[PDB]
Design a protein around this nucleic acid. Structure first.
Length: 173
RNA sequence: CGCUGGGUAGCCAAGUGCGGAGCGGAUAACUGCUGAAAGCAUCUAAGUAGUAAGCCCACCCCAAGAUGAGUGCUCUCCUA
C-alpha cells in the first residue's frame, strides 16, 4: 500500500528530524510539517525515512498513508519542485506578468489583477499557457485552482482556462 | 372667525436634505487544492482556499436597576 514505502531522499536534501516535527532542508526551500499524534517516524542511517504507526487504530491507518505521501511531497517538493501547466483557451484570453502581480484578460470588462505569491515562480512562455512553478504541491494547486476559478471551460463554448491533457466535456449544440 | 382675500413665527408635506457602507469574521448549498481507509480514485477522514440580500460585527439611538450596579476627572466633610 501507500504507507509501506521508503521516502526516496535524493542528493543534497538534508533530513532534519525534530520532536513531533519534520524540518526538511532542500536546495529550493525548507518545508516544515508537524507530526500527527499517532505517527512516529524512524530512519535507517541513510536517505530513506519510514513513518510508522504509534497505536493500533483506524485513524493511524488514515494518517499513515496520508502522512506518508505528504512527506513524499515534502522531499520531492523541496528537491525538484512541482509545476502546473495552465492554458487559456480561445481568442482574447491573454495572460501576462506585472512584476509582482499577474494580469488576466479573460473577456471581462477589466482584466483580473491577481497577485502571485513569493513562493511561486510563474512563467508565461507563450501568451496563452501559464506554467505555475513552485515548491509545495498544495500551494501550486490552490493558486492554479484560483486562476482556474474565473473561467472554467464551458462545453458549448469550448473555451476557458484548462490545464494540459485533462479531458473536458464538450457539446455540439 | 358672519362670509370671503392673502400671511410672519409654529406644525405639516406635496416641499427640502440625508441614509441603506464594508479584499470586515465565520458559514449553508456548491466549486475546489493537496489526500489516504481498498499502491486507481474521491472537496475530507489530517490541514486548507473562493463564496449568499442569510448569521455576527461595523452603521444610528437608548443603555451599569448589567444588583455582575463599571471606569476616569473634580468638589466637600468644619466649631464645641
Amino acid at each position: 500500500r501507500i504507507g509501506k514505502q521508503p521516502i526516496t531522499v535524493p542528493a543534497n536534501v538534508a533530513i532534519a528530524m525534530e520532536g513531533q516535527d519534520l524540518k526538511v532542508k532542500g536546495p529550493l526551500g525548507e518545508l516544515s510539517i508537524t507530526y500527527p499524534r499517532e505517527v512516529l517516524v524512524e530512519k535507517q542511517e541513510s536517505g530513506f525515512l519510514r513513518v510508522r504507526k504509534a497505536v493500533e487504530t483506524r485513524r493511524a491507518n488514515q494518517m499513515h498513508g496520508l502522512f506518508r505521501t505528504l512527506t513524499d511531497n515534502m522531499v520531492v517538493g523541496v528537491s525538484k519542485g512541482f509545476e502546473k501547466k495552465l492554458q487559456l483557451v480561445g481568442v482574447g484570453y491573454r495572460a501576462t506578468v506585472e512584476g509582482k502581480d499577474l494580469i488576466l484578460s479573460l473577456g471581462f470588462s477589466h482584466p483580473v489583477r491577481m497577485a502571485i505569491p513569493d513562493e511561486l515562480q510563474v512563467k508565461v512562455e507563450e501568451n496563452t499557457k501559464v506554467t505555475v512553478s513552485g515548491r509545495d504541491k498544495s500551494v501550486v494547486g490552490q493558486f492554479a485552482a484560483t486562476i482556474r476559478s474565473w473561467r472554467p471551460p464551458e462545453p458549448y463554448k469550448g473555451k476557458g482556462v484548462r490545464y494540459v491533457d485533462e479531458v473536458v466535456r464538450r457539446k455540439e449544440g
